[PDB]
Amino acid sequence: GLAVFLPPYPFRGLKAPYLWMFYKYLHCATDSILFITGEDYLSVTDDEAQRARWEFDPASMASLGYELPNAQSMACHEYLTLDNAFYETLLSRHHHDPIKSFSAFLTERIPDLETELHALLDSKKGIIDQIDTFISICNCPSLEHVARTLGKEVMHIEIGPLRAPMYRNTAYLDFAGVNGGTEASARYEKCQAEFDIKASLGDLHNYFLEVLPPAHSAAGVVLQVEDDSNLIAYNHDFTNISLLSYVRQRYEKEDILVRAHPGSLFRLRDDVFTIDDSANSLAFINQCNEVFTINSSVGLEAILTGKKTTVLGDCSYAFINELAGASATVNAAAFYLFSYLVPFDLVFNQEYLKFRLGHPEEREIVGKHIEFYSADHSLSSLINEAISLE
Amino acid sequence: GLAVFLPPYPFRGLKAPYLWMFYKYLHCATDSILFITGEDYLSVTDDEAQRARWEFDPASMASLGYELPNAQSMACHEYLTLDNAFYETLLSRHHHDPIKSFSAFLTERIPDLETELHALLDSKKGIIDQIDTFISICNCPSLEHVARTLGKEVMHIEIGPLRAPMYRNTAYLDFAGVNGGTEASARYEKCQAEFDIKASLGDLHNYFLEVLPPAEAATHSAAGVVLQVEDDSNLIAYNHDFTNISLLSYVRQRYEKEDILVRAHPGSLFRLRDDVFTIDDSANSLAFINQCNEVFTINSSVGLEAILTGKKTTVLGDCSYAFINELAGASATVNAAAFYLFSYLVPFDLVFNQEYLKFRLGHPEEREIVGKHIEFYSASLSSLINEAIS
Ligand SMILES: Nc1ccn([C@@H]2O[C@H](COP(=O)(O)O)[C@@H](O)[C@H]2O)c(=O)n1
Numbered sequence: 001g002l003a004v005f006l007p008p009y010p011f012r013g014l015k016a017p018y019l020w021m022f023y024k025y026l027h028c029a030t031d032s033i034l035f036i037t038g039e040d041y042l043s044v045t046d047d048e049a050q051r052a053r054w055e056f057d058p059a060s061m062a063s064l065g066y067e068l069p070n071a072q073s074m075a076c077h078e079y080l081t082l083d084n085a086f087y088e089t090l091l092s093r094h095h096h097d098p099i100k101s102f103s104a105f106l107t108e109r110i111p112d113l114e115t116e117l118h119a120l121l122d123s124k125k126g127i128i129d130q131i132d133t134f135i136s137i138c139n140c141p142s143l144e145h146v147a148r149t150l151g152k153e154v155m156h157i158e159i160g161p162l163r164a165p166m167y168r169n170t171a172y173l174d175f176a177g178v179n180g181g182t183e184a185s186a187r188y189e190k191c192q193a194e195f196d197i198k199a200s201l202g203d204l205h206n207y208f209l210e211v212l213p214p215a216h217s218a219a220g221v222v223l224q225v226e227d228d229s230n231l232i233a234y235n236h237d238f239t240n241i242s243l244l245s246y247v248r249q250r251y252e253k254e255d256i257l258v259r260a261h262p263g264s265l266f267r268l269r270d271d272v273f274t275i276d277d278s279a280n281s282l283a284f285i286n287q288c289n290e291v292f293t294i295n296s297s298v299g300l301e302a303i304l305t306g307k308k309t310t311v312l313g314d315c316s317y318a319f320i321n322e323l324a325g326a327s328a329t330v331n332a333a334a335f336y337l338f339s340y341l342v343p344f345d346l347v348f349n350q351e352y353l354k355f356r357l358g359h360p361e362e363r364e365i366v367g368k369h370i371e372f373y374s375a376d377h378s379l380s381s382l383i384n385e386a387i388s389l390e
Numbered sequence: 391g392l393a394v395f396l397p398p399y400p401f402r403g404l405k406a407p408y409l410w411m412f413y414k415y416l417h418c419a420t421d422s423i424l425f426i427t428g429e430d431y432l433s434v435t436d437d438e439a440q441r442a443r444w445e446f447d448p449a450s451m452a453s454l455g456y457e458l459p460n461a462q463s464m465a466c467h468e469y470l471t472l473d474n475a476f477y478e479t480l481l482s483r484h485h486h487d488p489i490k491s492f493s494a495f496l497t498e499r500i501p502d503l504e505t506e507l508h509a510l511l512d513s514k515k516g517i518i519d520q521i522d523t524f525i526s527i528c529n530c531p532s533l534e535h536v537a538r539t540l541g542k543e544v545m546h547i548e549i550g551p552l553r554a555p556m557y558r559n560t561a562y563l564d565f566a567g568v569n570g571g572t573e574a575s576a577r578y579e580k581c582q583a584e585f586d587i588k589a590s591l592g593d594l595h596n597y598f599l600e601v602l603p604p605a606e607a608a609t610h611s612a613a614g615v616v617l618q619v620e621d622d623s624n625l626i627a628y629n630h631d632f633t634n635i636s637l638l639s640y641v642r643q644r645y646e647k648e649d650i651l652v653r654a655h656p657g658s659l660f661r662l663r664d665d666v667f668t669i670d671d672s673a674n675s676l677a678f679i680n681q682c683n684e685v686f687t688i689n690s691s692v693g694l695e696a697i698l699t700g701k702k703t704t705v706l707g708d709c710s711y712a713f714i715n716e717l718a719g720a721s722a723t724v725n726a727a728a729f730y731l732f733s734y735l736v737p738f739d740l741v742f743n744q745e746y747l748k749f750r751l752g753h754p755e756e757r758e759i760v761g762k763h764i765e766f767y768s769a770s771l772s773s774l775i776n777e778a779i780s
């Protein structure tokens with residue numbers, strides 16, 4: 001079975017931070033799952049003070065394709081719960097800075113965590129050999145170290161850069177890391193000769209677009225959520241304010257359009273920059289000549305719509321932007337969209353997960369994904385035909 | 391099949407640094423092996439400007455239990471060879487410091503290396519699917535990153551802390567790391583209840599000794615200092631910044647020179663002048679330890695030896711046996727040392743035995759591992775060890 005790692009540590013001040021993934025795996029479950037998580041994930045539904053959480057919003061449920069679990073759904077699965085005394089102790093060892101503690105969690109081994117993980121997995125004999133793979137929503141060298149000792153793989157799985165309602169829902173699935181330390185460029189370089197796609201970047205974009213496009217600054221600045229893992233561990237020290245300064249070296253304010261992340265706690269004053277108030281990020285980038293980002297999903301959007309895009313942080317799609325030719329870029333973007341990204345529902349499907357655990361060929365992977373997208377032959381022929389059929 | 395990684399990079403100034411492991415795997419091969427190495431490893435045996443190397447010394451060959459390979463032995467296997475152009479670039483990227491370059495190789499991902507490893511593995515079709523596991527003589531996050539992407543384990547394998555002629559030959563086998571980042575303590579914490587050993591510390595030592603221990607020494611020094619090879623990976627990456635000279639300084643903070651007995655590593659390029667420290671000239675490290683009341687080390691194999699003789703031991707670097715030293719009780723120390731010697735350590739010949747390697751690759755219970763080892767040494771878990779100690 002699956003072992004799904006969903007840590008309770010409230011690095012960003014929220015209990016059960018990964019609750020949506022917990023609910024999605026429960027809803028799409030076909031077999032018993034081992035959940036390595038916290039007690040908060042189980043008691044959140046009866047906590048009256050948390051009922052305004054977006055995970056309980058029917059619009060969010062419908063968008064991500066899950067419904068709330070009942071006692072019956074819960075009982076089908078096994079649970080190991082992590083203790084909070086470690087989180088306090090973790091904070092203690094990082095000057096009580098929860099963000100730097102989060103950074104350590106993402107990028108460093110933590111012996112105490114490894115110990116507790118080993119003890120939990122051993123708490124019931126048989127558990128370890130039932131495990132076919134670990135799943136984690138984030139990079140975690142503590143878990144990954146434990147996994148090597150036990151001979152288990154770690155799939156890193158997260159909602160992707162293209163999301164409903166603007167796009168078909170996508171997801172990341174990466175054996176090495178998600179967002180940071182990804183294997184997308186390595187996978188592409190191995191199979192790049194198989195990609196000869198007769199389309200433009202905009203044609204690729206259109207395939208994933210689910211809506212009629214919205215239909216004039218030189219510089220567009222994409223801002224992100226300030227305490228996102230992307231801006232904590234994978235940012236190359238860049239922040240929203242230093243990204244702005246970067247762009248301000250290169251442009252006068254009259255040529256700068258800034259869009260804050262809707263999910264941010266902060267937003268711009270309207271005295272100094274021209275502030276974007278578009279209804280979506282696509283309408284925002286469409287007004288810009290070139291786009292600047294650290295490692296936002298919107299960076300990929302900019303690339304697919306043909307805009308010159310600057311990416312200052314580490315991210316899974318950055319290698320697409322580093323290629324010189326237009327044809328080379330299209331082929332890389334096609335691999336990324338059709339083989340690296342996964343149809344969202346599939347990374348919660350145990351049959352698909354077992355398929356990927358076998359480490360099949362890129363051709364098979366693309367075949368599976370297009371089969372899903374076309375729910376309604378060479379690799380390049382598959383993609384070209386899919387694009388043509390629309 | 392096995393994939394054995396033996397890098398050609400001459401960090402310490404010597405071509406084909408891991409030549410002995412190459413020859414040993416060739417000798418004990420029972421199936422075709424994939425060697426990821428350098429062409430320096432292939433040309434040395436008939437390069438007669440290289441005759442004076444220790445790997446060709448009949449004493450070394452007998453001691454490690456191998457013979458030189460002939461042309462027919464070589465032809466049984468597959469070879470992928472790494473380019474030197476990367477090494478030069480690696481050096482220029484680390485201020486032309488070969489030692490700090492070695493450190494990065496040991497502790498950091500190197501994108502260029504990963505690209506080449508992926509290209510070599512992908513060079514000829516069929517190779518990756520026939521790999522059961524990678525084997526590396528050292529930590530290498532570049533290789534380990536590649537292995538995650540391909541879904542393969544990495545066994546870290548090296549000669550152990552107990553070696554002939556003084557002891558039975560032992561080896562390390564560790565899925566997480568060798569010397570640094572080891573999984574010894576994690577494995578022990580998981581199974582420590584199974585180790586209730588009713589034998590003395592001396593009984594354990596005696597089991598591994600091939601010779602009788604030295605008689606009670608006339609005259610004892612208060613403090614013994616173990617020096618190591620200055621550019622050993624243990625003093626480069628796993629030393630916690632300690633060096634031979636800072637270790638000496640450490641002890642001098644606690645002892646007058648007249649109470650200090652220092653033993654240089656026989657393999658070192660350097661040795662102490664004759665007039666400031668009392669210099670050891672014992673026939674072996676065991677006779678040296680015997681003259682000391684307590685022993686100080688960074689992370690030498692001799693540290694384990696001091697522990698096995700019941701001497702108070704200070705360990706300043708990271709190493710696999712350190713967790714033994716951190717216990718308070720003598721009986722608890724015995725139990726842990728028993729796990730270490732019989733389950734963590736492997737009989738030397740077996741780590742070159744493909745059947746044994748496939749056994750470990752199945753991640754069997756500790757009881758099974760101990761049984762396999764004792765079976766070799768003899769030519770409940772505790773009762774099996776208790777009886778062996780005899
Ligand atoms: N400046 C921004 C950043 C993100 N977003 C929205 O948030 C989604 C996720 O973006 P991030 O990867 O930056 O968090 C985008 O696909 C987009 O819909 C936005 O609308 N404006």
Ligand SMILES: Nc1ccn([C@@H]2O[C@H](COP(=O)(O)O)[C@@H](O)[C@H]2O)c(=O)n1
Binds near residue numbers: 654
């Ligand atoms: N100061 C030292 C260090 C090592 N040695 C020898 O070298 C072997 C390997 O030790 P290292 O781990 O320090 O390299 C020891 O088992 C011992 O035989 C020694 O004789 N004197």
